[PDB]
Amino acid sequence: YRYTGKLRPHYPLMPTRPVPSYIQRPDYADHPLGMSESEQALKGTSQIKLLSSEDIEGMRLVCRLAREVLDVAAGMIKPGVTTEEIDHAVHLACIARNCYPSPLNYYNFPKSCCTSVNEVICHGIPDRRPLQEGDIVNVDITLYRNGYHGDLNETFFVGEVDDGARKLVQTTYECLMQAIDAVKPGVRYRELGNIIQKHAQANGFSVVRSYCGHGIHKLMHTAPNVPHYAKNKAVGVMKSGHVFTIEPMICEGGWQDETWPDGWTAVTRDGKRSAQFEHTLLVTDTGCEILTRRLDSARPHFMS
Ligand SMILES: CCCC(CCC)[C@H](N)P(=O)(O)O
Ligand SMILES: [Co+2]
Ligand SMILES: [Co+2]
Ligand SMILES: [K+]
């Protein structure tokens, strides 16, 4: 394998972290290949679930807890801390909240969160590499509680970063907020990518195409599929009761991605940097509730 950038995996990994048996587990947790019976059963569906009041409560809770855990991880970002150390803290933080770390054994994913440094687009595996001054790092948190998953991520600065890093992360955040702002009943899911690409491109960045936002509730990933690029073919129209994510990945260079031989780590083919933010959103009668919103600050971590 020829790496696309300077980053390399830092192995061996610590042995897999166990979750106490009293934490309720999603169906794939114990599947030998980490496959989900219920996602298999609904694979290929276009029908978007209208959540019940009890579902909405379940989603509010799990998403609030996911936010808390992401916030635990943000508090750790600094030069010298390994992504593994971050994952350990995130794993304990999930357990402490009576939640299962959703990524753990999802299609055999080895860790409890995704850490994506620099040219990693998404799904980086926490490992022995210490964070370095000037890195950007996304931490992606997904938690599972009482039958519900809650999904969010933020990109962070590691010490002082260059102007190019500032601009990429800022623009990425602005792309997310511009898309969220459009969400309300009657809007086509395919329109969000127009908004995202328009802003990214205006700033000289490209929009990853291979990974999309998604419905989320009882399944981790389900309808609708939500592309972040312009003129996509997404099916569906927003209605009050819909729950989905928007999670744009934006890049310094080209949009093209490839996967490391670990089967997960998605990197820019050119080796240039990529940033992402993600919220889980509930469509309301009037607009949208940001279920994974920070409660104790109006701003994401990179802005302070
Ligand atoms: C590799 C795992 C993928 C998933 C989380 C897994 C439950 C991510 N949080 P995503 O949907 O890519 O935001
Ligand atoms: Co996520
Ligand atoms: Co997601
Ligand atoms: K990245």
Curated annotation (Swiss-Prot):
Q: Does the keyword Zinc-finger apply?
A: yes
- Molecular function GO labels: aminopeptidase activity; initiator methionyl aminopeptidase activity; metalloaminopeptidase activity; metalloexopeptidase activity; zinc ion binding
Co-factor binding comment:
Binds 2 divalent metal cations per subunit. Has a high-affinity and a low affinity metal-binding site. The true nature of the physiological cofactor is under debate. The enzyme is active with zinc, cobalt, manganese or divalent iron ions. Has high activity with zinc; zinc cofactor is transferred into the active site region by the ZNG1 zinc chaperone.
Keywords of the record, alphabetical order, are:
Acetylation, Aminopeptidase, Cytoplasm, Hydrolase, Metal-binding, Protease, Zinc, Zinc-finger
Q: Which domain of life is it from?
A: Eukaryota
> Can you tell me which residues bind a protein?
H123, H221
> What are the binding positions for Zn(2+) 4 in this chain?
D151, H214, E247, E278
Tell me, in one coarse class, where this protein mainly resides. Answer: cytoplasm
* Residues annotated to bind Zn(2+) 3: D140, D151, E278
Cofactor names: Zn(2+); Co(2+); Mn(2+); Fe(2+)
Cellular component, GO annotation: cytoplasm; cytosol; cytosolic ribosome
Q: What is its EC number?
A: 3.4.11.18
GO BP, one example? proteolysis
What is its subcellular localisation? Cytoplasm
Q: Which reaction does it catalyse?
A: Release of N-terminal amino acids, preferentially methionine, from peptides and arylamides
**Quaternary structure note:** Associates with the 60S ribosomal subunit of the 80S translational complex.
The role this protein plays is:
Cotranslationally removes the N-terminal methionine from nascent proteins. The N-terminal methionine is often cleaved when the second residue in the primary sequence is small and uncharged (Met-Ala-, Cys, Gly, Pro, Ser, Thr, or Val). Required for normal progression through the cell cycle.
Which family does the record claim for this protein? Answer: Belongs to the peptidase M24A family. Methionine aminopeptidase type 1 subfamily.
Protein name, please?
Methionine aminopeptidase 1
Query: Which species expresses this protein natively?
Result: Homo sapiens
Gene behind the chain? METAP1
Which part of the full protein is shown? 81 to 384 of 386
